[PDB]
Symmetry: C6
Subunit: 84 residues, 6 copies
């Protein structure tokens, strides 16, 4: 997946998205994005938007957005027990 | 084919799609075949996420995991 | 092309397709699928559906569906005289 | 470009598209060029199968084969 | 980019396009095509059509169409000073 | 990402899109990030060319070139 964060987005940036202190962006295959959306919905301080699905946008304060992005990335790696 | 499971999905997750959701992504031919195995599986509800993009399987964890296993087994089975 | 057969399809499977004892499925490039559709239309015991074109679905009894699939595959290989 | 011919097409085949049908698939630029050669060819009717996906050429076998040959010749013809 | 010219197009060819002595055709990525469209709009003797954007069609007399195609191709190569 | 600039665009060029137009093409995630840099840049107007395909930046040459430089710098910036 691709991960990006936009700090202090302009109204124009929000308008492009929807046509927040921070915007976390995640792009991938739909199956990956639906999984990521679930982690983000369970994260405190964030609002989740499915950009139509092409992209996943996470809105909130920087700290909450960064924490939700870290959680999504950690769950994505999925290096569980018996992985070999 | 890609296989994923979401345990205890939120309403928001279900809203994006529409106690466990099994997700399967592949080529349409593969997904139509997988949908048939899932429809024949006990304890699961099947949803084609649409031009079909993804296959979603709803139910209790045990039933979802069992349906995913049968789909994967039927896909990977000759010289 | 990709070839698959679904034996004793559920109503749900038919609903996914249309949104039969057997369903023969063929996926390929449109030119290949239009050619395949012609072989299937000339085959006894089968009904042909163009899934919109993404996929070609052949409906009927197993024997008729398998015979139509074999014919499509045989015509596709096209190892005619002077092929080199 | 891909080239195929369907001899004695059924009505069902014609229905999917809309005594011989010549089919040509390629990039749009190539197909628009091919359509021009086919429109200038004797005994054939030209149909752009649509965002144009495929080019269909209808007529008697001899005319369809002759139009296909001219399209292929014009496409493959310098140092 | 791909470049083609159709000399003495039939009405059917024009109908396929719009659904001229010559038709210049240019296919590429949108950014490349928008740049090409500008060169063509500044060229004498030609009319420019964006085929929807999939393709760029240039209409006019052969000489004007060929001159506009040459200009587009020359500007596309962009081997300017300090290129290394 | 692809970057291009059109100096003194014609009305026809502007019509295809909708004294200098800066064009940036890339993946949506990259383009949304670039759009933010461009919206924060002096002397430029930002247009998302649409499902967003391309980013167009309008203004005087100096402002357009400065906004393009900042987009490119922010994109290319660790071990």
């Amino acid at each position: 997946m691709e991960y990006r964060i936009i700090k202090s987005p302009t109204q124009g940036t929000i308008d492009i998205l929807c046509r927040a202190d921070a915007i976390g962006l995640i792009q991938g295959r739909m199956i990956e994005m639906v999984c990521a959306a679930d982690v983000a919905e369970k994260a405190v301080g964030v609002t989740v938007e499915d950009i139509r699905m092409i992209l996943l946008a996470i809105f909130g304060d920087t700290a909450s957005v960064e924490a939700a992005m870290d959680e999504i990335r950690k769950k994505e790696t999925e290096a569980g027990e018996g992985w070999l």
